[PDB]
Amino acid sequence: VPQELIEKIKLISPGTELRKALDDIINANFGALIFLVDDPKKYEDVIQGGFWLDTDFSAEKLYELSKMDGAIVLSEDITKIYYANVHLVPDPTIPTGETGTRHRTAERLAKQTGKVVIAVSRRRNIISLYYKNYKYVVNQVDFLISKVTQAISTLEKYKDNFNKLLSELEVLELENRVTLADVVRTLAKGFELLRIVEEIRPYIVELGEEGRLARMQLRELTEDVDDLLVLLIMDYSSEEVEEETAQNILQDFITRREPSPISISRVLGYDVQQAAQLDDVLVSARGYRLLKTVARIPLSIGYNVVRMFKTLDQISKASVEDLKKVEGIGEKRARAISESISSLKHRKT
Amino acid sequence: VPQELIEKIKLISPGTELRKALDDIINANFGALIFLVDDPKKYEDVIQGGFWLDTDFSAEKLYELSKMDGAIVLSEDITKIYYANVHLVPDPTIPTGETGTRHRTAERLAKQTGKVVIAVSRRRNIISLYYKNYKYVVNQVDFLISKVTQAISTLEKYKDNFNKLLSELEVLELENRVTLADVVRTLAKGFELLRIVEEIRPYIVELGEEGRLARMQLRELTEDVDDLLVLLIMDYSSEEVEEETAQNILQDFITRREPSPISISRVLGYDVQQAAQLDDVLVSARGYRLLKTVARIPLSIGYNVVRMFKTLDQISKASVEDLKKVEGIGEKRARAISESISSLKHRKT
Amino acid sequence: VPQELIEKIKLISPGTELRKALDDIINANFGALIFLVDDPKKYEDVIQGGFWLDTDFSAEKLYELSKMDGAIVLSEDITKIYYANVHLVPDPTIPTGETGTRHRTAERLAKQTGKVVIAVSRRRNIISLYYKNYKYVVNQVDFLISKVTQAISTLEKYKDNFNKLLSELEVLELENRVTLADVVRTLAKGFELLRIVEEIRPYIVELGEEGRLARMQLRELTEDVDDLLVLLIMDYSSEEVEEETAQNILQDFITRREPSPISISRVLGYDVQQAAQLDDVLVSARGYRLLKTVARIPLSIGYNVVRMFKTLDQISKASVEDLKKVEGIGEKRARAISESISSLKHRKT
Amino acid sequence: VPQELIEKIKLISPGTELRKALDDIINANFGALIFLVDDPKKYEDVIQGGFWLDTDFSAEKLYELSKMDGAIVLSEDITKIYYANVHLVPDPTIPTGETGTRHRTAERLAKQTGKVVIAVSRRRNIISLYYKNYKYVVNQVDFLISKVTQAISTLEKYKDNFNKLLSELEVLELENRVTLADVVRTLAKGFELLRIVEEIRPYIVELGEEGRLARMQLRELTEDVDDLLVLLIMDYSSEEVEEETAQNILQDFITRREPSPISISRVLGYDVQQAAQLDDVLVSARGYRLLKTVARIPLSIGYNVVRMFKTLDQISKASVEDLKKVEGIGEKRARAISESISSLKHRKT
């Protein structure tokens, strides 16, 4: 969904004066045919008849002008109403896949001029927007809120299961009993959770102002999940990896690649073939996840701690004095790490 | 609900071009009478008048043809529109339980020809589908989403209570203090939970594309519940039972048998008569549930471990060396079992 | 809301053939005036004109007969349609508080004859039922489901807070650090929770078949709450009390009395005046709640255990041998009590 | 939103007889123009024609009078209907921003007379209320319930995250490992949570009777949150602060100031500039939060305990005898504090 088109779609999104008028028009069962031009002078040949207005835009004006037949002509920035009641005459040899004169006209004209054309039928309560060769249908808020509410509910359940997986893995991590299965399983649920988010984003966008609460709900459900998955990947990849690499793996099981168990493990540097094999692969976390998240050690200095101790299991045994021997951590960070890890082990075991 | 009928119902399910047209037709308060034929030549005697079209199907075409009186005739695969505006003349001595000419015609014709006949009244917003001797009413998405959302909410609350029961039983299992009451109670809630799922499945099906999120929500709520109940049954049945047997018991308190306390215990091999008696019946888990779920030991090799130690209580005491004496578990699986059980006992006690 | 009236209301509740017809009638904006008689012969003087039918009832018939003006006459059991298109002529000197001829007629006739009269206006989508001197408005399912869904959500939040209170009190109970404030607070939330349930019950009833899922949701949210509050009251009342007494106290803060802190404590046998005073009142549970709920000791034998040890704190210290000295508990129940209490103390402390 | 206006808005809020009539009027697509006067004699010059009624108000009467053209005139207390079918003639030189004669009339008249004028269009289902120079649009319950339900869902997710933050901080507080980051983070989420509540309050108000359940849901979600944040602020401010001061800080990140990390810490008496700096700032709670909340020690006497021991870490080490040396706490309060803190440390560590 190209961003040029996305700019256009915000023109008719909930919260704009234009959408308020369109909403009223829909509610009244007037139709609508709106041509978004910037230099009205130049479209002289596709505009016939009607009334030259050159007046300031407003929702009420647009509404009232919609009671008349034919099309209305607006400035691209929706600040001026140029014409009402016009007959729009695009080239009829232009191919169109639309039904009925209103939408065939709108599609042809949008392709011929590269401008925006908005079309609303009298009966159907749907806003179709034609721009160049695109066509985007904009839904009513009723419909959007319902799909978004379903999705957020869906997200909740993924998040719960992700939290269960994660706290289970936490026990295993502190006890150095982690298998590749435990990691891959946790990652997969995280990946799926963020995917759902990706899938619903266009709806959130289509909701405009009306999607303020949904945006907040998403953010609460997912805020630290990206960072968390990136740290898991860093901690359990077969060979070490920079933040940026891991960050790109995350980026990908969310978009280009589907996250199957075998897929994730292979991408993690493990040569595996079958499901049942993952339970037999033992792995130890380098310790980045707890160092950043719990010990609040910058991932900057994290590497230093890892390169000295290699794994979280070692780090958990290090004395303050031992830990202090690392560069990037002094007296304060030493106690932060040992007390963090010591506290977690005594509480989750 | 026969599967032949089920195939037919997906023809008009959300996501098909046909349903999109039907939806628009409903919204416009046109009626509809649609005859799904494959060899139009052969129904010459039940089709009079109207227009021979033989044109490619589309939702917009079907919509427009619906503005006219009478019936429309489609190919069974919904790729061709054969007729519009026809008078359909089925045998009127065929018994019908329908009201008004449209639905009496549809029922009679569907029985006479064994084909599909779709009928939509102008006022009522409901799709009736007649096929042979069946009649299936298809609901609007509005109505389906509401019932499904209620059911998922219902499921949530069953799942919570099931989780509470289960984690309570977990304590009891690790401490070898389990009574038949604790088991039967846990099982019953699981059974009821899966039943609700069974009850709502037709609605999920009727939702078609529009039920993608509900499917995902169900799966998250229930994924490992079947396996879990099967393992409980295996662990607490009076005499030992194969996976397949237990799997069939589960299959049944979900469908053919209602899961009362006494019922479940009797089916579990315990000769009991009264409720209050179950609290006095002491039972010990063989250990399959934790061996598979937590120790990630294949149920294959599980039996071997059980047959040697008889119960989870024994298994929890076995040394690695002891455990290693079992066939099917080596050095890795030994530590997996003892560390698993050791970890759970120290955390839940 | 008298039960005679309640029987009548189920006549038009979701799931009945009558309601299905009424629903369709509402959707069509026909009006309706329905007179529920058993001996049509005897109402000769309040029924003029129209058509004598004496036909079997059905929803479709009732619908079709509703297209005509005037009233329809049914048998009380809704098995026969006696008249259609009649003019109903009740005594006009009977006082009525209704507007417009349809509802004035319905109210007067219902009072004059003590029978049921159903009235539906063409515009408004509401079912009014007159019977004797009663008038009950029945709402659409749309409206009911929304209020019930709000209430269940409300209930959820009360239940969560009740669970938090309760598990907090559990810690305090095991450590013998309970004050009257802790008890009263817990009880109050329980009382409020069950009250909400009481408040919504008429809506659940009005929902008929359509309220199956809401009934299940309520039951899951509240199943063991009554028993739990009754046990709290038994455990923390100033003087000992039978089950039945406590059961009646519960029954009352739900209905006749509003449950303020001071109120509940005074009803609990504590002479208190001010809020802040409750924190200073130390109390110890007799131990009924854990004996029944956790030790699965019948409240029958519970008393015996209490009368010997007086409090849960004592009971928690008793040896098996000590406990066995009680009548009603043998070897099995002794270990059940000591292991129960021992397990809880080690897990919640 | 001035309170004079707020009084007026409750006139047309769900639950009033007036709103019931307005609702019916909307449902019937009658328009409405209602003038709320107390001394009808004095508005002789802005009221022409129509019928002098001087009758008692009722919803049904108002409805019926709405079938006629023109305006209706009511007493300010909505107890009398004075006129119907009148032509209202306000000064037309009064500036108005409304469209169409009904709403231009209503705005002008409301400004000219300082009285209330209610206007309802035939098509649009919206109630506009003009009073003096104000204009308030009142929404349908449908619309309000949807926004409120979204907000409560939003609140839930903030509350969960706030609870997680808080219980995490609890561990840190008992172990004396708290940094300014931990405090500021917790506070911020609390602040944001109460803000959302502030944002939705007008909707709750607009819901009138129909917002009983939403009010209860809010109260359950937020009851002890204000007190909790006030105690955090008291416990972690750089210099000591009275209840009232802290209570005013809370009051402010909810309203006048946006709660950024740096903002909150600076307002907390810490001279910080950058985000990353907060993790390095070590802080110890004075102990007010646990003393009040858990030890149920009045904040009155709290200060005394603090001024002697300075921090929660000290207090946690004090003997009963030590603690008893404080004024305001005797034998009972000593054991309350040491047992409280002792219990929490053993359970959360």
Ligand SMILES: Nc1ncnc2c1ncn2[C@@H]1O[C@H](COP(=O)(O)CP(=O)(O)OP(=O)(O)O)[C@@H](O)[C@H]1O
């Ligand atoms: N080239 C054109 N220029 C200006 N206005 C046009 C136009 N083509 C159509 N319209 C306007 O759209 C009206 C008819 O378009 P239709 O395709 O029939 C939309 P509709 O009738 O509302 O859809 P419907 O099928 O859901 O009822 C015309 O009467 C006209 O006012």
Ligand SMILES: Nc1ncnc2c1ncn2[C@@H]1O[C@H](COP(=O)(O)CP(=O)(O)OP(=O)(O)O)[C@@H](O)[C@H]1O
């Ligand atoms: N044998 C038949 N063949 C073709 N079309 C038929 C038909 N019988 C009925 N129809 C179509 O259906 C129309 C009337 O059927 P009705 O039973 O009255 C449905 P309706 O009027 O929409 O239901 P309603 O009672 O909810 O208003 C006819 O006018 C016709 O166009």
Ligand SMILES: Nc1ncnc2c1ncn2[C@@H]1O[C@H](COP(=O)(O)CP(=O)(O)OP(=O)(O)O)[C@@H](O)[C@H]1O
């Ligand atoms: N005594 C009576 N006997 C039989 N039918 C009656 C009746 N009184 C009224 N009716 C039926 O009800 C119709 C008018 O009643 P109204 O009070 O106007 C209901 P309505 O018009 O649907 O309510 P509305 O104000 O919402 O529009 C009459 O035309 C008649 O068919």
Ligand SMILES: Nc1ncnc2c1ncn2[C@@H]1O[C@H](COP(=O)(O)CP(=O)(O)OP(=O)(O)O)[C@@H](O)[C@H]1O
């Ligand atoms: N000064 C005035 N005094 C009394 N009544 C007035 C009035 N001005 C308008 N009205 C009433 O309002 C009616 C027309 O007002 P409109 O602005 O057209 C509201 P509407 O038509 O319902 O809005 P709409 O644009 O959504 O359709 C008049 O016919 C009149 O009955």
